């Protein structure tokens, strides 16, 4: 293949793609996705990372809203984010740990935006519906 | 003066290097040991060349930042107010809460912010030097001025100073609380709705830039303002008191208690009066002990009661300097810094 | 009165007191209020301030989690917070504007922690229940 694509990078494997459907889960009375909503989303992701690193690895890492880098924002509200080290951009948290962190605190992220597991798709993290307990 | 000071400093440093040949572990003479301690302190010579240069650079930078600190209106950056003129007048005369607040915050945001990183580096370097001189911290090096060892009953440890100061301030606190309550109550009437009767005093309402002195608050806290304070300046003017007889009166006061007279050359070499505009000289009242029985006073003395008291203060300094003239030059100083 | 209290300050009028009751609104399955929860709360408050300054005053101000200063934290989870300028501590947003911002986006703050207007009391901002519409 002759040429190159300006979208592939050696660290692009670590990106996690988020797709948000505001007007399907809420219908009317649905807020618009401006920069403040992106700030809140990055804060929620950083909070989830903090919770995972505190409750599993027993490490206190001060993540922030600037450590969740977001790209490829589109009107569907579907972007790619990756979480780096607190003050060291060259270090990227591996995607497995980020997926575990999202799984641990997905309910809180869902509640922060009033979305339920179908309008907030992380495209690689699939929810579990729950076993259907049987009568005696 | 720069050449003379440099020569003196070089001589002091080389003599400090030479003094290391006599350790204190074998000196049995108290006076000799004290002179050895005075001439043996390495000071800043114990750090490396890079560290010493960095320390001098940051010290000079902080001094220049404090000296050149100016508050400028963003509307017109050309016009600025310095610390000594105007800004002190704003903090010591204005009765406007907002104006005093602006002056205080501007001074502490234009100078303090520029000094914070330099001060962090200064703390680290001073700690390094003190540890290099067998001191736990630079504060211990400062407290060492009151250290006494090897003198029975008179020994004093560097850690004892902190406890003594705290114990003394605990006894001072009852008086300070009442003074603070009275000052707060009196200030409630001059800055209403800003001074809570249950809380503390805002920092910019203490008559001075930093709150170090409450003197400028006197006009707002005088107990009985209808009774004038004791002033004798006009009495001095009526009796034609020049800046030559007040020093004679102070000398008579000193001799009345048995202290000796003044030296013959003191009056001739002194500058008890301002030299006018022809000769440029400083005006801070200072006492100079040049040595070999040469004691002088420099003062742009006016005709004022405060000038009389300052002359008495400088004559006290002069008498103290004269008292220990027979002592070795290394011992020609007070018992401590106070 | 002789003496002084170490809790009064000229800027203490601008503080807003928050009282949180986790174990009453949730009973069981209630998370603990660690530092990550405080970080999320400050992020939510900053988001509310951004929304208010964007949708009312038409000013884009980049608030952050460091611009919501919090003090007097206690085991009841009741503290005092005030919001300052984005990069200028000496400037404090007046309490009226902060109250308006909280009123505008109180539902989002409630949803972020799964609390409902009774377990998250701002002690000065009272909610409105809603008019009881009458039959014909
Ligand atoms: C911000 O985050 C970034 C992350 O993005 C971070 O950058 C990293 O920093 C660490 C710490 O300094 C770096 O780790 C150093 O790497 C040096 C590079 O030399 C080595 O490079 C190869 C590394 O492979 C390792 O892992 C593989 C798989 O496990 C293993 O097989 C390797 O052996 C090695 O352990 C390695 O291939 C390479 O090989 C040399 O030797 C082989 C023979 O073994 C020879 O055949 C090769 O030709 C070559 O000569 C080499 O080993 C490395 O020098 C350095 O090691 C020194 O220090 C450690 C202690 O720290 C000693 O144990 C060691 O003996 C050396 O003295 C260390 O391993 C990492 O590479 C950075 N990554 C990037 C992308 O930059 C920043 O530091 C962060 N910044 C802040 C401020 O936090
Ligand atoms: C970070 O945030 C902080 C906020 O906390 C911010 O600090 C503020 O910065 C602004 C901008 O520089 C400051 O505003 C300046 O204030 C200067 C202070 O002098 C005035 O102080 C009193 C202010 O009262 C004002 O409001 C009242 C009520 O509306 C009104 O009555 C007053 O007239 C005045 O408008 C004022 O009382 C005082 O009075 C003087 O004059 C009276 C006669 O009128 C006399 O009787 C007094 O004795 C006294 O001499 C004085 O007016 C002020 O100098 C300055 O004004 C200059 O610039 C403006 C343009 O900016 C010109 O219009 C004006 O003519 C002057 O040239 C300006 O008003 C504010 O005080 C700061 N507050 C604090 C707490 O520090 C920082 O800047 C922020 N930092 C960053 C990086 O963003
Ligand atoms: C410590 O040394 C000093 C200095 O020698 C002694 O003080 C006197 O100093 C003068 C002038 O230098 C000498 O002429 C005397 O011989 C010194 N001794 C006396 C007794 O006058 C001081 O006495 C010494 N201290 C002790 C304890 O011997
Ligand atoms: C001063 O420095 C020298 C070496 O530079 C060292 O031997 C000595 O112990 C230090 N202290 C004193 C008091 O001389
Ligand atoms: C002391 O000095 C004053 C003036 O300086 C002089 O009048 C007085 O005579 C002197 N004392 C003696 C004993 O001469
Ligand atoms: C689905 O299963 C996971 C574990 O596999 C569990 O944590 C999650 O709560 C389940 N979802 C339910 C019960 O709704
Ligand atoms: C209560 O009233 C306010 C306006 O006063 C309104 O915004 C709010 O939604 C009301 N609460 C309801 C309808 O539950």
């Amino acid at each position: 293949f002759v040429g190159w694509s300006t979208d592939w990078s050696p660290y692009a494997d670590q990106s996690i793609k988020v797709r948000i459907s505001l007007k399907s889960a809420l219908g009317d009375k649905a807020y618009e996705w401006n920069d403040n909503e992106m700030y809140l989303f990055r804060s929620s992701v950083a909070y989830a990372m903090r919770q995972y690193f505190l409750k599993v690895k027993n490490q206190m890492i001060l993540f922030g809203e600037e450590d969740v880098r977001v790209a490829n924002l589109k009107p569907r509200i579907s972007f790619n984010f990756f979480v780096t080290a607190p003050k060291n951009v060259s270090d990227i948290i591996p995607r497995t740990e980020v997926e575990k962190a999202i799984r641990m605190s997905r309910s809180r992220i869902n509640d922060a935006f009033r979305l339920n597991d179908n309008s907030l798709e992380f495209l690689g993290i699939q929810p579990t519906l729950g076993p259907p307990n049987q009568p005696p | 003066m720069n050449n003379a000071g440099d020569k003196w400093s070089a001589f002091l440093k080389e003599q400090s290097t030479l003094a290391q040949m006599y350790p204190l572990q074998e000196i049995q003479n108290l006076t000799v040991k004290l002179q050895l301690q005075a001439l043996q302190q390495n000071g800043s010579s114990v750090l490396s060349e890079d560290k010493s240069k960095r320390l001098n650079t940051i010290l000079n930078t902080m001094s220049t930042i404090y000296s050149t600190g100016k508050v400028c209106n963003p509307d017109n950056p050309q016009e600025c107010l310095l610390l000594e003129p105007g800004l002190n007048e704003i903090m010591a005369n204005s009765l406007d809460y907002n104006e005093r607040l602006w002056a205080w915050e501007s001074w502490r945001s234009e100078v303090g912010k520029q000094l914070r990183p330099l001060y962090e580096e200064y703390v680290v370097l001073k700690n390094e030097m003190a540890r290099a001189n067998h001191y736990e911290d630079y504060g211990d090096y400062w407290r060492g001025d009151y250290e006494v060892n090897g003198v029975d009953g008179y020994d004093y440890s560097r850690g004892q100073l902190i406890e003594d100061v705290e114990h003394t301030f605990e006894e001072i606190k009852p008086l300070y609380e009442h003074l603070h309550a009275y000052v707060r109550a009196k200030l409630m009437n001059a800055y209403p709705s800003y001074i809570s009767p249950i809380g503390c005093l805002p920092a910019h309402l203490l008559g001075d830039m930093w709150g170090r002195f409450w003197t400028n608050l006197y006009s707002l806290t005088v107990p009985f303002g209808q009774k004038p304070n004791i002033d004798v300046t006009d009495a001095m003017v009526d009796q034609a008191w020049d800046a030559q007889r007040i020093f004679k009166e102070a000398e008579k006061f000193f001799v009345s208690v048995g202290l000796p007279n003044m030296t013959q050359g003191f009056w001739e070499n002194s500058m008890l009066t301002d030299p006018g505009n022809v000769q440029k000289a400083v005006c801070h009242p200072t006492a100079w002990d040049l040595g070999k029985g040469d004691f002088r006073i420099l003062m742009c003395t006016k005709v004022t009661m405060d000038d009389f008291l300052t002359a008495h203060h400088e004559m006290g300094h002069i008498q103290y300097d004269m008292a220990y003239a027979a002592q070795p030059f290394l011992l020609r100083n007070g018992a401590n810094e106070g």
Side-chain angles (χ1 to χ4, degrees), chain A residues 1-132 134-136, chain B residues 3-5 8-11 14-20 22-23 27-32 34-39 41-52 54-83 85-127 129-247 249-251 253-263 265-267 269-276 278-279 281-291 293-301 303-306 308-338:
Chain A
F1 173 80
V2 173
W4 55 86
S5 66
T6 69
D7 296 337
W8 182 87
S9 47
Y11 61 88
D13 298 349
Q14 318 295 340
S15 305
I16 297 187
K17 180 172 178 184
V18 172
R19 178 195 307 159
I20 301 184
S21 301
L22 292 179
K23 296 189 64 177
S24 67
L26 302 185
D28 290 349
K29 68 183 63 177
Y31 48 90
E32 57 174 354
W33 194 263
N34 46 8
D35 298 335
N36 312 341
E37 301 293 339
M38 282 302 305
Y39 170 81
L40 183 52
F41 182 82
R42 289 181 297 178
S43 296
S44 294
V45 172
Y47 159 79
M49 296 299 302
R50 288 193 179 188
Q51 294 282 56
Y52 176 76
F53 272 77
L54 178 56
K55 296 184 178 303
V56 172
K57 301 185 181 303
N58 263 90
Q59 303 176 14
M60 182 53 181
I61 305 299
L62 299 172
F63 288 100
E65 69 100 354
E66 60 176 350
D67 300 326
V68 182
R69 315 212 166 273
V70 169
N72 295 117
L73 181 57
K74 282 182 180 177
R76 175 59 201 274
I77 314 171
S78 61
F79 43 85
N80 310 87
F81 81 95
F82 55 94
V83 183
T84 71
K87 201 164 294 302
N88 182 20
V89 180
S90 305
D91 188 7
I92 292 188
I93 305 302
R95 182 178 178 170
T96 64
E97 296 185 3
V98 189
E99 290 185 4
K100 295 179 181 180
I102 294 301
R103 272 192 177 94
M104 171 171 301
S105 301
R106 190 167 183 172
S107 177
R108 306 297 307 279
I109 304 181
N110 290 334
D111 294 324
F113 298 95
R114 292 184 290 192
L115 309 179
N116 185 25
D117 282 335
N118 289 329
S119 53
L120 180 55
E121 321 169 20
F122 283 86
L123 296 190
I125 294 93
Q126 294 184 350
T128 71
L129 305 186
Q134 64 178 19
Chain B
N3 299 329
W8 173 253
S9 178
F11 174 80
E14 63 91 8
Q15 293 301 330
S16 174
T17 58
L18 294 182
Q20 304 174 352
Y22 314 100
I27 305 300
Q28 302 297 332
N29 188 335
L30 279 74
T31 298
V32 174
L34 290 180
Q35 299 176 70
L36 171 70
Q37 295 177 20
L39 277 186
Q41 42 184 0
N42 284 328
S44 60
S45 301
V46 76
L47 292 174
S48 63
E49 174 63 29
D50 292 337
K51 286 188 175 301
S52 178
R54 180 57 179 175
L55 185 60
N56 292 332
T57 302
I58 62 182
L59 287 180
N60 202 330
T61 311
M62 292 193 306
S63 177
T64 51
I65 289 179
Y66 176 80
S67 63
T68 62
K70 58 184 65 177
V71 170
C72 314
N73 295 332
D75 194 311
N76 184 13
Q78 179 60 221
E79 50 178 351
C80 304
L81 296 177
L82 295 177
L83 175 61
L87 204 54
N88 291 337
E89 293 182 350
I90 295 177
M91 288 301 305
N93 299 331
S94 176
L95 304 184
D96 189 3
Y97 185 94
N98 287 326
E99 177 181 11
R100 297 172 61 88
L101 173 56
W102 163 76
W104 183 84
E105 178 63 20
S106 299
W107 177 254
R108 274 172 167 76
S109 64
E110 297 298 328
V111 180
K113 288 188 175 182
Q114 300 177 357
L115 287 183
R116 176 59 182 267
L118 310 183
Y119 198 77
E120 294 183 345
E121 304 180 22
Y122 157 87
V123 169
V124 178
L125 268 55
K126 287 299 184 177
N127 279 329
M129 188 268 290
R131 295 178 185 277
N133 289 344
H134 293 79
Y135 285 106
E136 49 180 359
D137 53 73
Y138 193 58
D140 191 60
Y141 170 78
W142 272 343
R143 297 188 300 267
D145 294 2
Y146 299 100
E147 180 183 5
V148 177
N149 299 321
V151 188
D152 199 0
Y154 301 110
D155 290 330
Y156 198 94
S157 63
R158 298 188 300 260
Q160 187 181 353
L161 182 59
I162 306 176
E163 294 181 350
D164 287 332
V165 165
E166 291 151 338
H167 157 79
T168 281
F169 183 72
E170 184 58 30
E171 299 187 18
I172 277 192
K173 287 182 78 63
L175 166 63
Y176 176 72
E177 289 201 358
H178 288 86
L179 182 52
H180 180 244
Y182 173 75
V183 160
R184 173 180 50 182
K186 218 68 175 184
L187 274 185
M188 286 185 58
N189 307 138
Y191 306 91
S193 301
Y194 292 119
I195 305 282
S196 176
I198 196 61
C200 312
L201 293 176
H204 62 286
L205 300 171
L206 300 185
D208 201 354
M209 166 62 66
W210 313 275
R212 185 190 176 194
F213 293 100
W214 294 7
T215 300
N216 295 122
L217 211 52
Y218 173 81
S219 63
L220 300 182
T221 49
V222 49
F224 311 102
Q226 298 297 333
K227 300 293 181 57
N229 296 333
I230 300 180
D231 197 339
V232 293
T233 308
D234 303 328
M236 276 180 299
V237 179
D238 297 333
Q239 298 184 6
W241 281 31
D242 55 351
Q244 193 72 12
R245 62 170 300 178
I246 48 184
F247 291 88
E249 299 289 341
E251 179 183 16
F253 170 80
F254 272 66
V255 178
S256 59
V257 316
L259 294 183
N261 233 15
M262 290 290 99
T263 63
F266 164 77
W267 296 76
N269 297 124
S270 299
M271 198 187 308
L272 310 182
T273 58
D274 180 72
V278 177
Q279 288 289 314
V282 307
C283 283
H284 295 69
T286 55
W288 308 89
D289 181 13
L290 282 73
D294 190 5
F295 310 88
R296 298 168 185 175
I297 292 184
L298 179 53
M299 184 182 178
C300 303
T301 312
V303 183
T304 317
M305 176 183 177
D306 302 0
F308 191 70
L309 302 181
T310 308
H312 274 269
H313 176 98
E314 300 303 321
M315 185 166 298
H317 281 306
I318 284 294
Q319 202 71 247
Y320 201 178
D321 295 329
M322 290 181 175
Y324 49 64
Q327 296 288 344
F329 163 75
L330 299 182
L331 299 187
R332 290 176 186 175
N333 196 19
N336 56 47
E337 48 189 356

